[PDB]
From a paper:
Cryo-EM structure determination was facilitated by fusion of a thermostabilized BRIL protein to the C-terminus of the [name] channel core. We determined the cryo-EM structure of PANX2EM to an overall resolution of 3.92 Å with applied C7 symmetry. The final refined atomic model, consisting of residues 35–166, 208–266, and 273–368, fits well into the cryo-EM density with good stereochemistry and is further corroborated by the conserved disulfide bonds in the extracellular domain. The human [name] channel forms a symmetric heptamer with a central ion conduction pore along the seven-fold symmetry axis. Each subunit consists of an intracellular N-terminal tail and a C-terminal domain (CTD), a TMD with four membrane-spanning helices TM1-4, and an ECD composed of two extracellular loops, ECL1 and ECL2, connecting TM1-TM2 and TM3-TM4, respectively. The ECD structure is reinforced by two pairs of disulfide bonds, C81-C279 and C99-C259, which crosslink the ECL1 and ECL2 loops. Each of the seven E1H helices harbors a conserved basic amino acid R89, and the seven arginine amino acids form a basic ring structure generating an electropositive extracellular constriction, which is additionally contributed by the E1H helix dipole. The hydrated pore diameter at this location is ~6 Å, sufficiently wide for passage of hydrated or partially dehydrated ions. On the intracellular side, a short α-helix (the N helix, residues 36-40) preceding TM1 constricts the pore with a diameter of ~12 Å, which presumably allows conduction of ions and small molecules. Nonetheless, in comparison with PANX1, the seven TMDs in [name] are positioned further apart, rendering a larger transmembrane vestibule.
The pannexin 2 channel ([name]) participates in multiple physiological processes including skin homeostasis, neuronal development, and ischemia-induced brain injury. Here, we present a cryo-electron microscopy structure of human [name], which reveals pore properties contrasting with those of the intensely studied paralog PANX1. The extracellular selectivity filter, defined by a ring of basic residues, more closely resembles that of the distantly related volume-regulated anion channel (VRAC) LRRC8A, rather than PANX1. Furthermore, we show that [name] displays a similar anion permeability sequence as VRAC, and that [name] channel activity is inhibited by a commonly used VRAC inhibitor, DCPIB.
Author numbering:
A (entry chain D), B (entry chain C), C (entry chain E), D (entry chain B), E (entry chain F), F (entry chain A), ...: 35 to 166, 208 to 266, 273 to 368
Write the structure that this text describes.
Amino acid sequence: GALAALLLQLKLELPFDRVVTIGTVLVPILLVTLVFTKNFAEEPIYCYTPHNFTRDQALYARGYCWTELRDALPGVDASLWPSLFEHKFLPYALLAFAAIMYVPALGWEFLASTRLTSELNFLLQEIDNCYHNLFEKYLERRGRSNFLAKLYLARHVLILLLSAVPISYLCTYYATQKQNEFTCALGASPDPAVRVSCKLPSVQLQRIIAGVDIVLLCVMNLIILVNLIHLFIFRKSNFIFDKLHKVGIKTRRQWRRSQFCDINILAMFCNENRDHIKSLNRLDFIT
Amino acid sequence: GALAALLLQLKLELPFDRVVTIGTVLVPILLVTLVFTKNFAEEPIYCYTPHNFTRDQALYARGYCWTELRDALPGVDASLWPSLFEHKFLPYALLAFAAIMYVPALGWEFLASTRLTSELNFLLQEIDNCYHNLFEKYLERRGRSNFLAKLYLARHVLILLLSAVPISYLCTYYATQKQNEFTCALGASPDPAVRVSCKLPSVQLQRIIAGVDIVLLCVMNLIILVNLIHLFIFRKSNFIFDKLHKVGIKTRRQWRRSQFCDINILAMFCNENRDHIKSLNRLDFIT
Amino acid sequence: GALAALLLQLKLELPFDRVVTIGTVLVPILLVTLVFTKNFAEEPIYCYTPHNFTRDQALYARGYCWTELRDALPGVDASLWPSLFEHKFLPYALLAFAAIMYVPALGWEFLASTRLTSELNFLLQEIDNCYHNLFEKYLERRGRSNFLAKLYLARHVLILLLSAVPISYLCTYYATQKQNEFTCALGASPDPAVRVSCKLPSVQLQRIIAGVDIVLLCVMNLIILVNLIHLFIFRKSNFIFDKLHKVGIKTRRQWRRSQFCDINILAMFCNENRDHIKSLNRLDFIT
Amino acid sequence: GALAALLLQLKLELPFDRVVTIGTVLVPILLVTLVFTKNFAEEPIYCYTPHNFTRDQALYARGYCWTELRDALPGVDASLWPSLFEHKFLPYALLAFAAIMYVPALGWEFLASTRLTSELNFLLQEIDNCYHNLFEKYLERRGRSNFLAKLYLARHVLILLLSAVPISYLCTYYATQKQNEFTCALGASPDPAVRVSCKLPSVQLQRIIAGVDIVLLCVMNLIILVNLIHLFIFRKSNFIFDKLHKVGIKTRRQWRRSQFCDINILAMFCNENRDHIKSLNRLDFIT
Amino acid sequence: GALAALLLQLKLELPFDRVVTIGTVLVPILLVTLVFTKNFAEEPIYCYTPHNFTRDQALYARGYCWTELRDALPGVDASLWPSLFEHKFLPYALLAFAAIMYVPALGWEFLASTRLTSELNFLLQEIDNCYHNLFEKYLERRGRSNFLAKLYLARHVLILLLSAVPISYLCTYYATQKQNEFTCALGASPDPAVRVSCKLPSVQLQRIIAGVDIVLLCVMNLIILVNLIHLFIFRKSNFIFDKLHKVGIKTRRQWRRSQFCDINILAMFCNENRDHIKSLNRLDFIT
Amino acid sequence: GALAALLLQLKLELPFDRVVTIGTVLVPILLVTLVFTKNFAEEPIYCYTPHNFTRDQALYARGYCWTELRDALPGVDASLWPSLFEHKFLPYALLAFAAIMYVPALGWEFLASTRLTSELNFLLQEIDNCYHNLFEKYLERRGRSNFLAKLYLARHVLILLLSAVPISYLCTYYATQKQNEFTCALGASPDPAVRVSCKLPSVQLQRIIAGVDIVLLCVMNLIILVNLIHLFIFRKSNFIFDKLHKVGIKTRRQWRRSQFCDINILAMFCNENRDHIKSLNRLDFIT
Amino acid sequence: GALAALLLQLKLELPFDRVVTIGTVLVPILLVTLVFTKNFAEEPIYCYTPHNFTRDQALYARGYCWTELRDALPGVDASLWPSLFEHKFLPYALLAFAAIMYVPALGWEFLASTRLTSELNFLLQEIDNCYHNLFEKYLERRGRSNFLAKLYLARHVLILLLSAVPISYLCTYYATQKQNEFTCALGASPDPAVRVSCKLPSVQLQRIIAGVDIVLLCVMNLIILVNLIHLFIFRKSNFIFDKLHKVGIKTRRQWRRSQFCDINILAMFCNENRDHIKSLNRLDFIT
């Protein structure tokens, strides 16, 4: 059994989950690191300075106007001056969104690690016996359990619910703030405050990234809905039933009565692991 | 036994412990490293300088006002000037809190490494024999021991007690330190001391981090309490008893008389390692 | 079976796919990283400054004229001033093009991982028996399937369709914009706006890279078309039929009627994996 | 014996030694590296400069006042000026203290590597035989050797003696130096020496580190003393004697006549390696 | 067969190919990286500046005269001003020329990875049979094939053809351009253009590297020609025919008629893998 | 023999050699790297500059006074001016001393790699036979060879001889070079040479390192001498003779007639590898 | 044969070759990297500057005088001005010398890889048979081959011939150029050329390195000559003949007639691989 031992690793992750993970979590991290690399290659703020100022006072003006980040208008008190804090706060939101989106994929394993592996191992061992009524009675008990169905459905729906947060915040940022210049007003005269106008060269790129992320995240939300409806309603085929050719009449009406059956979920992992069963081709040609 | 030897590793850590560790220790390290990366990308302090000063005197003024970090008020002596030391000392507190929270996880292993492994190995070896009165007398002696219960309870209750320190310090920091500008007063005239006002651009981000960490640490404190009560009081089921179908009358009343039973802790570990026993499915279908 | 177990890995990617991948995806990444390395070794913009300006105002002028990146002309309002944004936006387009071109290679595996491996394993196991009528009837069912053919054609035809985007954008950039100098006009006089003329030293190299990429990507588009026509139309030879020497007359007219047959794709993989069969040389010399 | 060969690594380090090492050696290295990281993020010394000085003379003044590091007072000659050298020399003392504390742990292995392993292997091999008078006479000779006891006691007592150096120096430093400003007086007039006052921004953090290390190192000194007395005086139980159930009366008097017995040290090692013996549970239930 | 399995790797690359690769491809990469390391340790251009210029105008002058890289002469219009472009472009051309020459090594592997290693196993296996007429007729069919000869010849001749590009370009660069100074003329007067003379300190080292690479690449071109003629024409010896001692007269005339035989190429590979056959020494001493 | 194969590694290095290596070679490398890290964290030389000097002339003065490193005195010609080259040349001396001290340890292996291993393997194989007159006559021939003794003695004495160089140079450096200030005199007047006084802030730490290294290297010299005398003169016990209990009278008087015996060296190696013989404990209890 | 398979690696490199390589090739690389590390930690050239020069012209002057690197003298035209190019060109010469010296060691393997291993394996296999006339006649044929002798001599003599280049260039550099100052004369007056005096602080260390390399390389040249004469002329002993005790009278005078025997080279290799033969000690004691 050296060959079996060397290839004893069993796939426990459907390709659809991998596609969803790649399309949802991995790409935003790459975009965030690209934005960070671009942002740490230039000075943060560029703006003007009167003639009388020395170098140190100019440095203080730049630092203060970057730290405060508050606009000003003529004839209006400071109680109504607009702010631009999210222009500086944006990337950390995406950094947190990556993890909050990744949580469910890690959550599923802690519940599906062992039981599914044991059941799959037992079924694959049993397939050898049927090549030539312990198994017949097993389907009756196993086919009325709906624990796996009640868990697989829960994982997918939670992704849809958690997707309302990132889209809502990005949608209200893309079409709300377009300002790029403001009149910073530092108040101090330790020899009538002076006024400067400053520019933010960190906005023409973050605008584009916030637009691509909306489209990419919305497509993944739609593709989940179409697969879920088709899977549990329209599909009336089971892989295990086709390759067995010996099923009792007592299991006929049960299968088309309710689709919330354990054997429905178990049918996929056997299909995706058809390599490990060596009697598939020989048995298929018999019929 | 090549297949068994290749997979001879036995799980020893419960999933709940892993969840608690991830939710308690790992995240604050990431937040601290993010804060450090942000903080080491700018100057420490920006502030003003009179016209007569040269460059070196301005540099000395900046350094002295950063090092002293003391406020000033008119008409008040130096004996009552407020300080702002937390704004400089904050991150190391979190750095120490990470380790002081991580200690119990290391402490558990040094006491539970070997005995639990040996007992589990003996039990899993015995399960083969019961498929077809050493075990009958074994439960009488083993069921009256309470060493594991007296240790598992101690590990969880210690986390709750140690959680009073980090929360108490962070709560009083959130609602007390709100100042951002002060009038530093350096006293020296080696040709009536001059006065400058300085700004700290390292406070608008540390405020937010100190708020998220409170909520995250408080939720994990509550989730521990609910699980402890349910496991040791309300749950009246043992995994080993259900899959054996052979229990003496004498051991029946001892099970519900007290809950501090050694078999109770052993029951959970066997459930999470049900893969290693190959007679589970065959024996379950018998009943 | 230690020797077989050690060399249990089976080749799954055809050499043509590897050649296409190397010629399409890998090289643009190297060109992009070379461009980035060259571009991050100098200042972004070089230009002039009047005599009255101090240092800080000159720095502000440089930064503002780099950020705006807008031309100016005499006697024309600002509503018709040309822009040069792609000179700054170019490399990220190639960075995205690399991945959007690489997608189909990753897409192929998720569908061709298991079934092809199982079929190849069964055929290689069986080929020992033919050395000395399940196989005779096997070609009847297998030879009328066309799933693999309907998938292999889809992968190649999708590369050609996706090649219209990168070619169109690069073609309209190489021979449209050749400007290198412009008269930036910053408007502010907080003591009649001053005017400066600036130079972009990041255009003489990106022009050459955009030319080589056009030729390299166009050649791979042509080489795919010639191979597709030859493989499915002109080639009238099958590897298995040549080395079997026992085929019924029923499979003769079927093979010469339609080329959209499943064994045609399976023939190539067996030929490239002729090492794993040890009866090839002995059987070939028999005829 | 593949399973035995794969797990042939026998534990040789007691958990108490690991706890002492972690509590004594590892933590000071982390504190030292934290101090170094903090210290290499700022200029070494900040201080003032008269108006007539140019830039180069100011740089020389800073460097000279940092290098000399000597105080000054009015009306007192240079023969009585206080110094502050250890403020600069502190971290290397801790760096050396780490290694000088770590020496004994490395020293013990070179003497305890082989003999203990050989005797433990012999005992573990023999335990199989006793399941069903070489061993009876073996304890007579082995029980009268005190080499291991004479070595284990020496290792622990040496740690206590070596702990007088690091505590004495740190304790006498925490409460002798609170100065932070001094009046550096550089003497040179290459056109009545000028005087400047300088500040050291590397003292408010090294004070706290030198306080924590005192408490942490002192607690580990106390915990060693309590364990040594309990193990060699109060404890009147041997693991090997309890699990044998076949012992002679001749060894009874020698058991509590003297505690410097070889089997006493071997008793702990067998207890912590109870996994490697498979007859423990079966033999224990017999009594 | 553990010893055979452990040493199952078969050499499939003649030493001559390794020598050619090392002498042709590897060295230019080292020279290019040395040139890059030297060139990225100094400023690109040094030159003069009039007295009235400030710092920013001098920086613009340096940058503009580096970017334009155009000479100037008195009394001649700008349409005939000589250029010095390739002084900035040489290293990238060297990298491209070092990377292009790697195609044949990859092509040979792609075209002969499998067939040679599949065919050689039969010859290595049959040695046991010949120790004590399948092989007699085997050489008749195998000795009349010329596919391998038609491929080995193509690989070597293709190296010679692609070697005419690097030699032609480097030869016309070593003895054409020796200029080192020029009179850059920037035209702009935002208050009769000023004139400066600039120096390129990146030409005295690239001259030497372009000379060594000519000699090294030319020698490898000659050594290939002499080996090709000797192997296919003058050499009248076959390794297999010397170690078999049983060949028919039919195979005699054909071997000396045409040298374009598959057995000729297979002779060298068997000679370099004489270790894997253990009957060589015993059979050799028989004759 | 899987267990023997897994642990087939035989120790071929006495612990004393490891202790000497750690105490002699490893520590100076750590001290040198610490000195280098300290030395590359500050400017090399600090000193004064007259008022009329500009920045570039001050930089030239610093560079010249650092390069020349020559003192000056009033009324004395340049032929008698003292030098201070050691303060700049010191670390490379230690860097070379490390290797010149490490040479013998590498040298011994090239001569003791194979013969000792083979003879030890033969002896360990033989020990099995003696459990139940080839060996009786073996000691007669083996006991009259002194090759191993003539080599082990030579390795240790060469260490003592090579220790005269590093100690002699360091001792004369500690008590001779104490200067820290000098009056550099650069001679040039391209408008009576000016004079400056410079300070070297790289001497207060290299003095302490040169003191610790003297004590550490001297103690290791003494510990070698005491062990050499004890091993070859006072010790009158052999491990192989004690555990054999069967030696002829002919081998008795030759044992203490001369101590330059091969079995004397082999006695130590067998003792350190007592684990590999499993009959030690059983045979020892027999007597 | 698991033990033999695990230790199937046969030594092929003689210790003398390893000593020559480590003494010739490895050390110069370390010296070159030390020189590079020293040279890349300071400014390249320190040079003076008149009072009227601005900052940018001073920056130009240093670079121009460093690039030209040409001396000047009064009353002599530029046609006879000495140069100092090797002061800048030195390290690359050593970098190339390392590789040109390393070539032969890599060259020898491509010719000695296979046949030596095959012959050694056959002989070691044969040694088993002689423990109890194919081998008798083998020495007659093998003893008259001189291919290995004609190759081993060629490898060593080529090292001596290639040693004439590095020594000749270094000897003519140590005692030819000792200049350290020169009067650079930049000619340009774009408002009678000015003159400055420069300095090269990269000469006092390259002088010492060029002195050590002469001695180290010359000693290794002498040690090769003495070993070559002793091995092939004076030594009249063969290891294989001593341990066989069975040589014909025909084989006696041939060995003492000519020393260019293939068995002579093979004898040394067997001596260093005496571990792999287990009958060495048993056979040696027989005589």
